[PDB]
Ligand binder design. Sequence first.
Ligand SMILES: [Cl-]
Ligand SMILES: [Cl-]
Ligand SMILES: [Zn+2]
Ligand SMILES: [Zn+2]
Ligand SMILES: [Zn+2]
Ligand SMILES: [Zn+2]
Lengths: 381, 381
Amino acid sequence: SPIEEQATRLLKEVPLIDGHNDFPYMIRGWFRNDINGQDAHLYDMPIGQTDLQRLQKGLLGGQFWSAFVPCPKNPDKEVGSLEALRQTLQQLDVIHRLIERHPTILQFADSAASIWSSFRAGRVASLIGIEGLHQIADSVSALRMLHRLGVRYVTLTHNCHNAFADAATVSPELHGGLSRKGERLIRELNRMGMMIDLSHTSHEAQTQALRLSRAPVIYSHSSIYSLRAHARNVTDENLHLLHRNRGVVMICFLRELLASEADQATLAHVIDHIIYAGTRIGYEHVGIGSDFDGMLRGPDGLHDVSCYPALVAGLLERGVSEEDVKRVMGLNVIRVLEEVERVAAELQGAGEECLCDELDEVWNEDIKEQLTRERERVRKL
Amino acid sequence: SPIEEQATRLLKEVPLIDGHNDFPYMIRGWFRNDINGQDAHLYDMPIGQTDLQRLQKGLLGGQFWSAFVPCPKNPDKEVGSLEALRQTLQQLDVIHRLIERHPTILQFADSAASIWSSFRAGRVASLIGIEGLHQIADSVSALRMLHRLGVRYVTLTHNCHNAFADAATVSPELHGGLSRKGERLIRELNRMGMMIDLSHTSHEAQTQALRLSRAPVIYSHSSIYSLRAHARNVTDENLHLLHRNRGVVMICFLRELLASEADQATLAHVIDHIIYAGTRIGYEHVGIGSDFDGMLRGPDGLHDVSCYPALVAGLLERGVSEEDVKRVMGLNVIRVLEEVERVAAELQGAGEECLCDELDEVWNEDIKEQLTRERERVRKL
Ligand SMILES: [Cl-]
Ligand SMILES: [Cl-]
Ligand SMILES: [Zn+2]
Ligand SMILES: [Zn+2]
Ligand SMILES: [Zn+2]
Ligand SMILES: [Zn+2]
């Protein structure tokens, strides 16, 4: 069809960059992060919605691979929080090993330039994000090291309240949006060049983050509230504040977020959600945030990662212009990552102070007096 | 003096690379890793043997900055082990922030080429190492992420036994050298290109590591046993196995390791230790491993980081040739890091399997059956 050829041409011209995929957690579930001699299975998986053959088939240009670990369930709160940090490094490790063992398909990217150079070579631009602040174990130092390991967005919560912000799906509220720590962390995230992700966060937490953030944010996988009322979806209030923020809402394929009955959800519903946001806040603030492998089953026509050409063709069929489809595919999320890095460079160039952790005193006054006495002895030599 | 001018010329021609300095832990002790508006103090410290003015004065070419955290003291063994991992990321964070805030003095390096390019520009080549396996929290995944963060050596123990190896200063013995896990970790360290450091490890643990390792190792800060009997010093047995391994013993300035009475220790004792090893196993297997800021007081003439020109002049005064002094200064430790990276490239190029952690099963048989049933449904479409 001339529409199918058009969709294939667009997928070759610009990268379709998906906002969120939990394929790394499926590798932890199925293989337990042991991928040695598992290429046959990694190319043709016996479970899930993602594998390396189907990833090629769908012509996907880039991917933010999620490094999610569950919210801590342990009665010992210190152990659970610290356990999440160790599991985070295990998931970042298997993501890096997955990319490194398959260099013909996947290539690591952590910027707008690295996404393009990956797309020119014919690879899937492989970026990384974490699904929740619980993953850092209350350590802003750890968060900066996660940025150094290649993490380029941080979802503020998953399905649990943390010290920084409230989750959408948990009641009662803890902070009523962001905490004081949360407000201060927004400045640090803008300073370091970490992209803020407002998926899974409460409506009040979104409103406060959108007003405070000096850089554009994203919703890595969230849908529209007006079309389907759910705690996880974005309200018209927050859609307008996203426009002022210059952020992007990357539309989710979760069936619960598209229809009241999950079995009724379809590819057409995803297109309705993209067109709604594109009509009201412009097509330069809308994206694609599948959440593949964060669900058992997908919508009719969006069953797995091979179905992206159907989404591009469906948007063109509805009268969304080529230029606007290219924006929704990936140009918008590239711009936000580019603007996040530019803001960080401005703030780092200006010499803004970084947020430091609260640490225990290791030395008492006796030790500090010995050290000062010792220094003075060396001065008199 | 013609000997002082000779020492200054050598320090400009080749980088003097010190094996171990604990200045990052002094920053944790004094500032609690909060260096915002502390440049006056960082250039002229009120404590310790290291600051940025004295670092320039001594003409030091490179430095392995230690990222040490204490051995876990907590009764809850899980909490203590996981706490060491979080503290490790705090110390790696402050090392990176120290380098980044002072780019005219310090420059990050993680290879032989990066050491040289740093030295050409007139910076101190700033490398990173961790002082003990307890710092990884039994996570080989975490260890690979520490390598990604810039860690280029790992001391197998500090002053405590761990799951992998025995420390020198603790009795009774636990593993009697390396454990089975330790033996398997040696292969993984060689594969990833992590330099093995045998300081703080028991004599038996050294012997087993030196025979097993396929790449050259180091002693980042250890002295000679024959001159001064101590658990921390290297025996003639292990010095010979270091020669076969092609490693380097970087001589320590700790007074306890140089003389029976600590107040008697001197610059002359450090030179005796360098000449002993250089005479018996050749000058291409000897280095300088100060351990500055891992001690209150240093030897007479080696009080702080400004005293390196006295060490170079002292070696030349004793009849050690210019070419051999250049080797002891830094060419040897550069070679070992270069050979460690070459061995890793050979093993990674050959497609050797990496060591994976033992993970818990997250899904039961009910969940796995749903995932396989779901995959088959998608196959029939
Ligand atoms: Cl602490
Ligand atoms: Cl686990
Ligand atoms: Zn997810
Ligand atoms: Zn999610
Ligand atoms: Zn030390
Ligand atoms: Zn030490």
